[PDB]
Amino acid sequence: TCPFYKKIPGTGFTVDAFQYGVVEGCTAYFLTHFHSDHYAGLSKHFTFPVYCSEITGNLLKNKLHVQEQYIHPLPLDTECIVNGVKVVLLDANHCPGAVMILFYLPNGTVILHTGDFRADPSMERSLLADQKVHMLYLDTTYCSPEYTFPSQQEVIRFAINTAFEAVTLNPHALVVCGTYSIGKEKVFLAIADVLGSKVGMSQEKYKTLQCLNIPEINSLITTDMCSSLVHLLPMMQINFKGLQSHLKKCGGKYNQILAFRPTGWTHSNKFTRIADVIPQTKGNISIYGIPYSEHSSYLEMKRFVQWLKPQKIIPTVNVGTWKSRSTMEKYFREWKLEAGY
Ligand code: NI
């Protein structure tokens, strides 16, 4: 049974609600992005209309085999009528194809559903500038002041400078980057660009990347592992055992691995600056955990919400415990008292 925070009142619409069977009264199922917790339940046997971005619809057709007749891609930043209701899709600054959804209800209420997002001041000059929002369905993943991390640009500068120094010292070093979903592609693309290499990967991951409308992608990635000195592997394999085993497979081309695990936040964020980050090392293998987030920090979230001034907030993450729900409600009231709405 579908929870209340996935239903849009006064419509036949749901958001990210594919794992509940046939939802009573639902005429259109929206999908914000192609991450497994959000598409859980979709498959080639799905027979109701799915609304989404073009990139999400490429992934639904090629990776999950959803039939074409049920995929309804919408352009971004463009007013569209769906089943009698005006909607707009906005870039969520999350993974490729991820959107926020503005719903203009027939009674005059305006609802923003952020999906998953990383708030940015550039959103203050989108189509959100133009009118008031009554209800905000908010990605609260990091809604507590302990959740701090650097800008994505600082993180990428650290990664590129670390990889370029290692491989210039030792031209026989291999760079490996962990992945387990779409998102965070800038990590491995920026490192391969400074090294003058294509990125090598499995046929399954190549297929996924070919769905993402990245400019000049054919110049950047390959399935020919032997030709490349930046490899992608499953995130589960980014450990000393898994990396040893991969180095065996490269036919004595390499004698060192430098590996990256883009995580979200970890408690090593509470003490260490990005500049001061060091790897875990065993023999000729070194592993860096780098804090590349595709969700809002606490401060980015608070800025967005204090600018938007919604009348009501509905969290969509961390909703399963009374302690989490009470913590989030306290911060919402602080923000509102401080800003005066
Ligand atoms: Ni996500």
Sorted by where each begins, the domain ranges of the chain are 1-147+296-341, 148-295
Nearest to 205 by CA among 243, 227, 235, 174: 235
For the chain, what is the radius of gyration of the CA atoms? 22
Alpha carbon of 94 to ligand 1 centroid (Å): 7
The strand pair at 99-104 and 85-91 is best described as antiparallel
Where residue 333 falls (left for φ over 0; alpha for ψ -120 to 50; beta otherwise) is alpha
213: left (phi over 0), alpha (psi -120 to 50) or beta: left
Q: Which residue type is seen at 131?
A: Q
Any bridge partners for residue 288, and if so which?
Answer: 260
CA 71 to chain centre: 21
Q: What separation in Å is there between the alpha carbon of 116 and the centre of ligand 1?
A: 5
Just give the CATH number of 148-295. Answer: 3.40.50.12650
Structure tokens at 329: 């409600």
Task: Give the torsion sign (CA, 291, 296, 301, 303).
Answer: positive
Method by which the model was determined? X-ray
Phi-psi region of 187 (alpha: psi -120 to 50; beta: other; left: phi over 0): alpha
CA of 92 to the centre of ligand 1 (A): 10
Cα of 235 to ligand 1 centre, how many Å? 16
* Residues measured by CB to lie within 5 Å of ligand 1, the ion: 35, 116
Coil, strand, or helix at residue 129? Answer: coil
199, 185, 164: which is closest to 262 by C-alpha? 185
CA dist., res. 87 & res. 37, Å (int): 24
Can you tell me whether residue 50 is helix, strand or coil?
A: strand
Q: Is 53 exposed, middle or buried (0-12, 13-18, 19+ CB in 10 A)?
A: buried
Bridge partners for 313 per DSSP? 136
Q: What are the Cα distances from residue 143, in Å, to 139, 299, 302? A: 9, 9, 9
Write the single-letter amino acid at 318.
N
The fold of the 1-147+296-341 domain, in CATH, is Metallo-beta-lactamase; Chain A (3.60.15)
Rounded CA-CA distance 187/190 in Å is 6
CA quadruple 252, 255, 258, 261: dihedral sign? positive
Residue 210 to residues 43, 58, 156, 182, 218: CA-CA distances in angstroms?
Answer: 20, 9, 23, 11, 8
Q: Exposure of 227 by Cβ count < 10 A (0-12 exposed, 13-18 middle, 19+ buried)?
A: exposed
List CB contacts of 138: < 8 A, sequence separation 6 or more. 114, 301, 305, 313, 314, 315, 316
What's the 232 CA to ligand 1 centre distance in angstroms?
A: 20
Give the bridge partners for 230, in sequence order. Answer: 175, 199
Distance, in Å, from the CA atom of 266 to the CA atom of 234, rounded to the nearest integer, reads 19
| Cα 166 off chain centre by | 29
Distance 181 CA to ligand 1 centre (A): 9
